[PDB]
């Protein structure tokens, strides 16, 4: 563990300093179906001609990135994603750009969003939630050791793979920062109090968001919800959280230490760091090594009828990919 994170940092630093660039072209792919939309872009299933592999292609309209003031965030997203390598992070296979758009081509995770299965089933049992939570704990351990904050944990950005394991996607708000940072970004239900209160914040916001995720997985609904974000914010800063009757005492004790408004007391941010979380009683039955090596049997395995099957994804309205004869935002995205 201790020595693995040292070797991992060296490969990351090499790619962080000299990122890959322009490793494919749009005409090398056939576009098939939209897998998902987000706040900023669209992700399509594509097939790579020479090879026949299916991939998931994220498409960002440069003008829309500019209008929403996401230039720096989008450059972080590609720079960080092409440099990381971890069993529970989507792999970036190609990236390129044209006159109008930025493209990131990822491995296709056919099992669908955690969001869809969680809403359909209603809630996950604690052993089921724990299996997923352990993968996120290890993923944040790895990312934080590289000085990375993720800042957008939620079931909509978590994908289930063929073996039933998690793949974290969407590095849109990820940032490499050694001190504090100040950007107000993320999803209202998952925002830590210190973000809302315009305090400088650090990697501890990821551990708060983990608490929210575990709650929502096990309860079926977020700990703080309302119809308008403003009322969500008021509940988050008040810190008062109620637990469902069926939560175990161990689960409630862990969540009280993750959903801790006081930065100095929040698990993950203390002297022992992530080991406070790994050593908690709720994880007593968790074999961290076996999870990392993907040797544990997944509690739920999605159905697949073949390569290119999208049945675990919702349908979306398809739109044409337009490319202008004139280059847009050429040098804003020079390093992409």
């Amino acid at each position: 563990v201790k020595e693995f994170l040292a070797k991992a940092k060296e490969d990351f630093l090499k790619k962080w300093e000299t990122p890959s660039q322009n490793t494919a072209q749009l005409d090398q792919f056939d576009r098939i179906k939209t897998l998902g939309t987000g706040s900023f872009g669209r992700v399509m299933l594509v097939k790579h001609k020479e090879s026949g592999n299916h991939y998931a292609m994220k498409i960002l309209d440069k003008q829309k990135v500019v209008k929403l003031k996401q230039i720096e965030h989008t450059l972080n997203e590609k720079r960080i994603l092409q440099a990381v390598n971890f069993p529970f992070l989507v792999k970036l296979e190609f990236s390129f750009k044209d006159n109008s758009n930025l493209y990131m081509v990822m491995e296709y995770v056919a099992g669908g969003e955690m969001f869809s299965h969680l809403r359909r089933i209603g809630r996950f049992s604690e052993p089921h939630a724990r299996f997923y939570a352990a993968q996120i704990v290890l993923t944040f351990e790895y990312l934080h050791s590289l000085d990375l904050i993720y800042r957008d944990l939620k079931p909509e950005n978590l994908l289930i793979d063929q073996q039933g394991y998690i793949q974290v996607t969407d590095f849109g708000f990820a940032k490499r920062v050694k001190g504090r940072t100040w950007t107000l970004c993320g999803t209202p239900e998952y925002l830590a109090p210190e973000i809302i209160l315009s305090k400088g914040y650090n990697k501890a916001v990821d551990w708060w968001a983990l608490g929210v995720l575990i709650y929502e997985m096990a309860a079926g609904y977020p700990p703080f919800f309302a119809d308008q974000p403003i009322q969500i914010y008021e509940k988050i800063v008040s810190g008062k959280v109620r637990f469902p009757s069926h939560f175990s005492s161990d689960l409630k004790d862990l969540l009280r230490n993750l959903l801790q408004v006081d930065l100095t007391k929040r698990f993950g941010n203390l002297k022992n760091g992530v080991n406070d979380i790994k050593n908690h009683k709720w994880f007593a039955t968790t074999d961290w090594i076996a999870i990392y090596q993907r040797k544990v049997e997944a509690p739920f395995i999605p159905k697949f009828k073949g390569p290119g099957d999208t049945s675990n994804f919702d349908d979306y309205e398809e739109e044409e990919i337009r490319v202008s004869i004139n280059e847009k935002c050429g040098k804003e995205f020079t390093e992409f």
Binding site: S39, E156, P188, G220, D227
Partner: peptide, 19 residues
């Protein structure tokens, strides 16, 4: 119930980010 209140709320679908 809390579940009923959530399911009747406007934020049961996929959630977008704030910026």
């Amino acid at each position: 119930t809390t579940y009923a209140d959530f399911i009747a709320s406007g934020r049961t679908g996929r959630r977008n980010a704030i910026h």
